[PDB]
Amino acid sequence: GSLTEDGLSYKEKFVVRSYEVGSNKTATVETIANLLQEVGCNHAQSVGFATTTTMRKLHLIWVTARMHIEIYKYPAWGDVVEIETWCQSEGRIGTRRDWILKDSVTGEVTGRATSKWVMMNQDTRRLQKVSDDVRDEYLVFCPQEPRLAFPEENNRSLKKIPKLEDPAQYSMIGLKPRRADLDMNQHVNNVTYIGWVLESIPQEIVDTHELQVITLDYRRECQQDDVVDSLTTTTSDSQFLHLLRLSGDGQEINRGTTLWRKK
Amino acid sequence: GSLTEDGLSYKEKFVVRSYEVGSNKTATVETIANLLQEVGCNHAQSVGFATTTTMRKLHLIWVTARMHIEIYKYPAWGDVVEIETWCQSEGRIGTRRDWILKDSVTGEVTGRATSKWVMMNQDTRRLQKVSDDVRDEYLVFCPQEPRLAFPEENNRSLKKIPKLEDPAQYSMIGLKPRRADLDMNQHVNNVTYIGWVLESIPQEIVDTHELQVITLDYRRECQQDDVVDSLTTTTSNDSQFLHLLRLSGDGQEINRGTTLWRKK
Ligand SMILES: NS(=O)(=O)c1ccccc1OC(F)F
Ligand SMILES: NS(=O)(=O)c1ccccc1OC(F)F
Numbered sequence: 001g002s003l004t005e006d007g008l009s010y011k012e013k014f015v016v017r018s019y020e021v022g023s024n025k026t027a028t029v030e031t032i033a034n035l036l037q038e039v040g041c042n043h044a045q046s047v048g049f050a051t052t053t054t055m056r057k058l059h060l061i062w063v064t065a066r067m068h069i070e071i072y073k074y075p076a077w078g079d080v081v082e083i084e085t086w087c088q089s090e091g092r093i094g095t096r097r098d099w100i101l102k103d104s105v106t107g108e109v110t111g112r113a114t115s116k117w118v119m120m121n122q123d124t125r126r127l128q129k130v131s132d133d134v135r136d137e138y139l140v141f142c143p144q145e146p147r148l149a150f151p152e153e154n155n156r157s158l159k160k161i162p163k164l165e166d167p168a169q170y171s172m173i174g175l176k177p178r179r180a181d182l183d184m185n186q187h188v189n190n191v192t193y194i195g196w197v198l199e200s201i202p203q204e205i206v207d208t209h210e211l212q213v214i215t216l217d218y219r220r221e222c223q224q225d226d227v228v229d230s231l232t233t234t235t236s237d238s239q240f241l242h243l244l245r246l247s248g249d250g251q252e253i254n255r256g257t258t259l260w261r262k263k
Numbered sequence: 264g265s266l267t268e269d270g271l272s273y274k275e276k277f278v279v280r281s282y283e284v285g286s287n288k289t290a291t292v293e294t295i296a297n298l299l300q301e302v303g304c305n306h307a308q309s310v311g312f313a314t315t316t317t318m319r320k321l322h323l324i325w326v327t328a329r330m331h332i333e334i335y336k337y338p339a340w341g342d343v344v345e346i347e348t349w350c351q352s353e354g355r356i357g358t359r360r361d362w363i364l365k366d367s368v369t370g371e372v373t374g375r376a377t378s379k380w381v382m383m384n385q386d387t388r389r390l391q392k393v394s395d396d397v398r399d400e401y402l403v404f405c406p407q408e409p410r411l412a413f414p415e416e417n418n419r420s421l422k423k424i425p426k427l428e429d430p431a432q433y434s435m436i437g438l439k440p441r442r443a444d445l446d447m448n449q450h451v452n453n454v455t456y457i458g459w460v461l462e463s464i465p466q467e468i469v470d471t472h473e474l475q476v477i478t479l480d481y482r483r484e485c486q487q488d489d490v491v492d493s494l495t496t497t498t499s500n501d502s503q504f505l506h507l508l509r510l511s512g513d514g515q516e517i518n519r520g521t522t523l524w525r526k527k
Contacts, residue, residue: 175439178462180291180458184281184286198442
């Protein structure tokens with residue numbers, strides 16, 4: 001991949017692999033979300049990084065607060081998908097990373113995503129607003145004018161998600177992460193939580209519908225030795241409300257919604 | 264990727280991804296085994312397929328009986344790895360698929376693998392010898408002279424694996440596959456079983472050693488709604504382990520294997 005002409009966004013092409021596709025011989029949403037993460041990392045590498053000089057001295061990291069993916073067409077096995085990604089400052093709240101997924105043959109937009117990121121101290125895990133010093137450093141890598149993947153004011157990407165109330169309609173209990181679910185820093189990958197959310201959707205929905213929209217709020221990380229319960233309730237196309245919580249005390253780790261279309 | 268000049272082997276280059284690497288910033292053995300599977304599939308596609316005309320008419324499929332991976336150097340995140348793969352007939356027993364992993368910059372061999380495949384009826388799950396009619400159809404895609412990734416007289420790839428006896432030294436109880444662990448035909452991916460085997464190795468071994476050799480025998484398939492227990496016992500400067508995968512309930516064997524680890 002490479003940075004675009006203006007050096008304010010990064011493009012990369014991926015060939016869809018045999019093991020990355022589902023029953024429909026098209027890429028799963030977890031494969032897509034893994035590709036978005038990879039193109040995000042390559043953009044950080046190409047511009048010099050993933051934290052700023054001041055962030056390293058202050059022991060601060062970027063953590064995901066929310067992920068919103070919208071797919072119109074999942075790429076088939078062997079197809080080439082092209083993803084363009086960019087970052088933008090959101091004042092002192094944090095940073096937003098957006099993506100556009102395109103068909104490499106037609107050039108049509110097949111999907112789009114947006115994510116919200118906040119600053120946190122590696123140790124202590126305290127949320128802190130973005131400093132004036134750590135702002136000047138990365139603003140040179142972001143476009144100055146707003147460039148939104150979801151320009152619609154008050155759309156699905158910015159809707160507040162409610163808490164699922166017991167009893168849930170569907171459930172998947174006792175989910176545990178394995179070594180492959182960890183990243184290079186031995187933390188659970190943000191993509192595993194997507195897989196866990198979807199585990200409680202009935203197989204009959206998965207077989208008869210396609211995932212169109214997925215919005216996921218991150219509240220607490222799942223440790224290597226933690227166990228998770230995945231809960232789902234229909235709120236409706238098919239709409240669902242999801243809750244990820246610890247098998248024991250029931251401490252919330254994630255909340256979200258999914259929208260599915262009949263095939 | 265592309266087939267080589269003679270049309271008897273397939274080469275492909277992969278850039279190592281951020282999510283594909285472990286704590287050491289090098290590709291995990293599950294990422295490697297996934298790449299071997301992908302290059303295997305692209306070889307089947309390039310030559311016209313992953314079953315022959317006769318195999319589809321008789322509802323027969325190719326199933327893995329054994330996998331043997333040996334890694335000298337795991338590629339780093341961002342490095343380009345090049346894999347060459349080929350198939351060879353083993354008479355009526357079945358087919359063997361071999362791989363060579365190379366560093367794309369130096370051209371040095373960083374790893375190698377071999378796997379044994381048998382014919383099975385997709386519906387009855389009954390195994391069978393390869394008929395001559397099937398053998399004539401795919402022999403045109405295989406080299407005629409033997410081309411072994413593991414030439415050695417006394418090689419690790421062909422050693423019989425014993426059954427782990429209880430009590431195991433280490434264990435990882437209640438492992439269940441999730442949707443991402445399934446392939447396009449809703450069967451558990453052969454690579455997930457590698458991850459499950461390794462789950463019972465203590466984290467202290469993983470942190471202080473590197474996986475050099477892994478041999479895994481496939482006996483039974485894990486269904487979507489099956490639960491697995493992963494057992495490990497040390498059998499040994501190097502560390503050797505004996506592994507057993509079995510169903511949490513009745514204890515029906517699904518896999519058996521060995522791993523060899525060296526100090527970092
Ligand atoms: N290092 S990074 O991944 O956070 C990054 C990459 C490209 C542009 C900006 C940016 O950081 C900004 F959000 F602070
Ligand atoms: N089994 S397969 O269809 O994946 C295949 C791929 C390339 C060459 C031969 C071949 O068949 C036979 F050698 F087993």
